[PDB]
């Protein structure tokens, strides 16, 4: 049973990190002369969780 719970939580972590991978690599893809680039509302805002390093 303990190993089962270990497995499920590690799977959750894996999905989290791969989502982060995709988001960051799309950010890298974005470059000049883009269709969806625009002025954003309070881009200076701070997130509501703000986890540290």
């Amino acid at each position: 049973c303990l190993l089962q719970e270990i497995r499920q939580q590690l799977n959750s972590d894996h999905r989290d990190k791969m989502e982060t991978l995709e988001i960051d690599r799309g950010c890298l893809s974005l470059n000049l002369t883009s269709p969806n680039i625009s002025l954003k509302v309070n881009p200076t805002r701070i997130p509501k969780d703000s986890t540290t390093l």
């Binding site: 950010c27 680039i37 625009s38 002025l39 997130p47």
Partner: protein
């Protein structure tokens, strides 16, 4: 005699001023498109800021 001297000097001076003005106009136009480039850069910056939200 002194009439003619005055006249020639003034003509040369106005020629000089003409060329200076033309150069100034070109320069101002250039700075204007430079400004447009800065606004496009700001668009890029805000979009990159937004992208980290998700």
């Amino acid at each position: 005699r002194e009439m003619e001297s005055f006249y020639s000097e003034l003509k040369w001076q106005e020629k000089n001023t003409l060329e200076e003005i033309a150069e100034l106009q070109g320069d101002i136009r250039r700075l204007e498109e430079d400004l447009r480039r800065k606004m496009m850069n700001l668009k890029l910056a805000h979009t990159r800021l937004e992208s980290r939200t998700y």
